[PDB]
């Protein structure tokens, strides 16, 4: 029960629900004011609540029917700040209807709401809805929202509209899918005659959606003005991976070419719509970290954008770069505030009244995240603010205020997560905002698995690795091995994060040890160990996993007979690609194997993922004929295998499995399978998730027990 | 598949001069679309009238 | 319809002849039976929707099962390789469920 409070002002935070009502705190002296009572239970169980920026209205989103990871369309109802008088937000000349997104402004009671891809804005809540933009069309033309590719692949969220700091104009991205190919997903439960569900899913080697940025004012004619991107010959096809208001009328926008090897950062002014090019970044393989928003000061002074500086050997690490408001075209003021064998995960804010830039980074280890503060003047002193101020967690995530005097800190593992208030002046702990006391007692109620770590080194590469044990280990008994990997770029499987899943339950009860080893291509551990997987995605990290197994099979307390693998999404490939027969005698590498929504033909996947790492599709790169485990899964002489995959999957389409199945038919190899008819890939319901958890362990217990 | 169980729906006359043939209208029959996966990169369902 | 109305009468008037015919009534128990289903994706006689509804009911009942699926194949398996694999699969399932 994490409130996840948001700093309204210099000395107050939202303090959302932890065990009921929504209360407002004051940092001055432990002062609490209730803004919303426990009426959300009787308010038709409002799923998500926001407050007006002027703290005068409260918006409730309830009856949500999610369709993607973040597409929580539902019903939005406004209510007075103290309590009472609910009012269902409505589109013009229409009664209550489902809403894609409404949101809130930065100031006043002004609000917007998106219905059937149309944004309608109300400066006054009492004022009825008025037409602001109507170019949007159902499933083809968007405005302020993201389609599938923009929702989960590159932008990693459905937020495609930006509010001006003064609440005067909105900057939204419009997505055109007219030339985007359309794919349908089968329906097996609808009615006597179920019909497929069609949506625009750009596969590899297809036409990506046409994204156009637009700005509309909130008063008067509200004439729309679009921002013209640069016109280099190698970026005509582009993604708007990120955009941020420099000021109330100047905006900073990022453009990543179709080959995603050139990223231009640009300033534009909404008054005339022209864009003034600022800088360009490229690399030998690709671009990375496309959603790090730079911090623009009050006066529009030097923004602090993380980018690839050479950082000596082991690739060009990612460090902050200083750039003035109007750098000279002859030479800019690029300056590496941070420097070391690490990067910055995110930048919080820079103290304009001094030299204190706060950021979450990996200064200690790539697998741990710490809060730190640097000096923007030649001192460049990366002082400890968190720097292991708590004995147990050593994991951190911080959020500052408008003056960044008071900030909230969260541990989140490996111990029970902590939520605390703190200040940058005294670094004193006034009180804990949330302690997870129920989790605190639960972690001692049962026999939690003990965690172990063992760093590995292969060639000139370092690779963290994590192990779990039932904590009641006896040397006489032998425990089987389970290997879980993801391997997707920009991820870190070996992390100290606290979590309860099927792995912990299985380790505790069924008596098995689980091992996770990070391989080549993962981020945060060196950009050289990231770009080397260009067109060679999968082989390097599975070689690393095989080496980890061979360096784990040496234990006297472990047996070679019962070794199992697991994977999901992209790891579904890995969980199938790590089953050879070493030599001729040292066979039976994995007795029982399982995977979730495995991918075998990357050309049947998104262009933004196939082209980005395996090379541009349509050119017959020959990586689309060598990254297919179908030729590798062919042997599988006697090892039985399992596949679990929902029918209505949109992340990795079920076709990926079916084709694979055909190969197995040609391979004449034993396999099992399970399905979930007309179910998404993100498992919104609890019953489905617990059924999957039961099924995976029920499959594993039989393949291990002898 | 269900009543005639025969591939042919026409019958020759004994003298080899005329034919008796059956014409079936399926327009009013509701249509089922069988899903397809192996077909292509953008597989399409096979539609036909399945009462 | 030609098969349904033959043994359950004409539908559309709530004849109350199909509610009890659904197999979901009996598949509730599934205490320890190692159940299994084999189905072709493009079956033109018994639609995949039948197996889908059975799987949904099994998920609701939380039973144990395994599934084998033929990707986009016809009904009677007029391919020698398909028949060979089908007989191999059924022989397998039965031998691993008869092993003592």
Numbering used by the authors:
A (entry chain L): 82 to 787
B (entry chain K): 233 to 283
C (entry chain K): 688 to 787
Sentences from the paper on this structure:
To investigate how DPPs modulate the properties of Kv4, we solved the structures of the human Kv4.2–DPP6S binary and Kv4.2–DPP6S–KChIP1 ternary complexes. Owing to the flexible position of the large extracellular domains of DPP6S floating above Kv4.2, the overall resolutions are 4.2 Å and 4.5 Å for the Kv4.2–DPP6S and Kv4.2–DPP6S–KChIP1 complexes, respectively. The structures revealed that one DPP6S binds to one Kv4.2 in both complexes through their transmembrane domains, forming an octamer for Kv4.2–DPP6S and a dodecamer for Kv4.2–DPP6S–KChIP1. In the extracellular region, two DPP6S dimers float above the channel core. In the structures of the Kv4.2–DPP6S and Kv4.2–DPP6S–KChIP1 complexes, the DPP6S transmembrane helix hydrophobically interacts with the voltage-sensing domain of Kv4.2, specifically at the lower half of S1 and the upper half of S2. The structure of the Kv4.2–DPP6S complex therefore represents a distinct interaction mode among the potassium channel complexes reported thus far. Although the side chains of the DPP6S transmembrane helix could not be easily assigned owing to the lack of characteristic density, the Kv4.2–DPP6S structure revealed seven hydrophobic residues in S1 and S2 of Kv4.2 that face and potentially interact with DPP6S. In the Kv4.2–DPP6S complexes, the single-spanning transmembrane helix of DPP6S apparently stabilizes the structure of S1 and S2 helices because it simultaneously interacts with the lower half of S1 and the upper half of S2.
Modulation of voltage-gated potassium (Kv) channels by auxiliary subunits is central to the physiological function of channels in the brain and heart. Native Kv4 tetrameric channels form macromolecular ternary complexes with two auxiliary β-subunits—intracellular Kv channel-interacting proteins (KChIPs) and transmembrane dipeptidyl peptidase-related proteins (DPPs)—to evoke rapidly activating and inactivating A-type currents, which prevent the backpropagation of action potentials. Here we report cryo-electron microscopy structures of the Kv4.2–DPP6S–KChIP1 dodecamer complex, the Kv4.2–KChIP1 and Kv4.2–DPP6S octamer complexes, and Kv4.2 alone.
